[PDB]
Amino acid sequence: LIVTQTMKGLDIQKVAGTWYSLAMAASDISLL
Amino acid sequence: LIVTQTMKGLDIQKVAGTWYSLAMAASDISLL
Amino acid sequence: LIVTQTMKGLDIQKVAGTWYSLAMAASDISLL
Amino acid sequence: LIVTQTMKGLDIQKVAGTWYSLAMAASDISLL
Amino acid sequence: LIVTQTMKGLDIQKVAGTWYSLAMAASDISLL
Amino acid sequence: LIVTQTMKGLDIQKVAGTWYSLAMAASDISLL
């Protein structure tokens, strides 16, 4: 598979917590 | 499969919690 | 698989917590 | 964009004229 | 962009004229 | 860009004229 993730002009503030990521791509994605 | 995820001009504030990601793409997606 | 993750013009502030990463890509992604 | 304008403890007196505003924020600001 | 404008303890007197504002923030600022 | 403008304990008097603002921040600033 071909994966293209593009982000332009983002403004993020006050992100208290377990922020994992913004763009995450792979073969198998299992989150418990 | 071909996956294209584009984001422009985002403004995110006060995101307390387990924010995983914004654009996530893969073969298998299983979330418990 | 081919993975391309592009980020331009990001502004991040006050990110208290366990911020893992912004763009994360691999074969297997398992998060507990 | 994220805009935060805070004012505490202001004392204004004798303001003869075309007083527009105190805190003004927007995308485009053109004043002739 | 992230903009934070804070004002505490201001005392303004005798402001005859075209007083526009105190804290003004936006994307484009053109004043003629 | 991240912009923080802080003002504490200001005393302004007799401000005859075209007083625009105190703290002004944005992307493009063109004044003629």
UniProtKB/Swiss-Prot annotation, chains A, B, C, D, E, F:
Alternate disulfide bonds occur in equal amounts in all variants examined. It is found in: Secreted. It comes from the Eukaryota. Synthesized in mammary gland and secreted in milk. Under physiological conditions beta-lactoglobulin exists as an equilibrium mixture of monomeric and dimeric forms. Interaction with LMBR1L which mediates the endocytosis of LGB has been observed in PubMed:17991420, but not in PubMed:23964685. Primary component of whey, it binds retinol and is probably involved in the transport of that molecule. Belongs to the calycin superfamily. Lipocalin family. This is Beta-lactoglobulin. It comes from Bos taurus. The gene is LGB.
